[PDB]
Swiss-Prot record, chains A, B:
Belongs to the glutamate-gated ion channel (TC 1.A.10.1) family. GRIA2 subfamily. The lineage of its organism: Eukaryota, Metazoa, Chordata, Craniata, Vertebrata. The chain holds residues 178 to 278 of 883 of the full protein. Glycans are attached at residue 79. It is found in: Cell membrane; Postsynaptic cell membrane; Postsynaptic density membrane. This is Glutamate receptor 2. The M4 transmembrane segment mediates tetramerization and is required for cell surface expression.
């Protein structure tokens, strides 16, 4: 299902209707494929509609896994996973991110 | 279980441990009996910890039912109820709430 083109004027009732139709298959495995400025919004709506108990298994398919406001679904028991090209543990990457900060 | 005296410095992990022991009881019916300052905080933690899907059922035993930030457990399907002495439908009350506002 497309989620990019939903207009901002009604971006509450749309995402409700969307997941309430995802209830047809009673779906619990999901992937979100969008840049983090969409991710933050749709994740906030997910937590607000309450569908982040354990069993939902959202995969974030972007290189900005920790860049999202991830640490709120963290505690819902819904498993979460993704992909990251940044590694804060590596040498000059680490020292740069220190410096950057 | 007391919820009034939990210190503000650590008022996140305590509320996890609290409800996680109710999860050891597998509890699904709950009552809160506290003023809004406690209500809003613990309700926020409830939604953040992911225990407000349908099946949970909360009674807010204070006279400030709509005064709380109730409108963000609204969509979780967890039933909610409370007790209200205020009635916006009343004759002079409505006109005062207009005036007040």
């Amino acid at each position: 299902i497309n989620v990019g083109n939903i207009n901002n004027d009604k971006k509450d009732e749309t995402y409700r209707s969307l997941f309430q139709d995802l209830e047809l298959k009673k779906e619990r495995r999901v992937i979100l494929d969008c840049e983090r400025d969409k991710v933050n919004d749709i994740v906030d709506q997910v937590i607000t509609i309450g569908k982040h108990v354990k069993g939902y298994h959202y995969i974030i398919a972007n290189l900005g896994f920790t860049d999202g406001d991830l640490l709120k679904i963290q505690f819902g028991g819904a498993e979460v996973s993704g992909f990251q090209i940044v590694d804060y543990d590596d040498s000059l990457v680490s020292k740069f991110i220190e410096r950057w900060s």
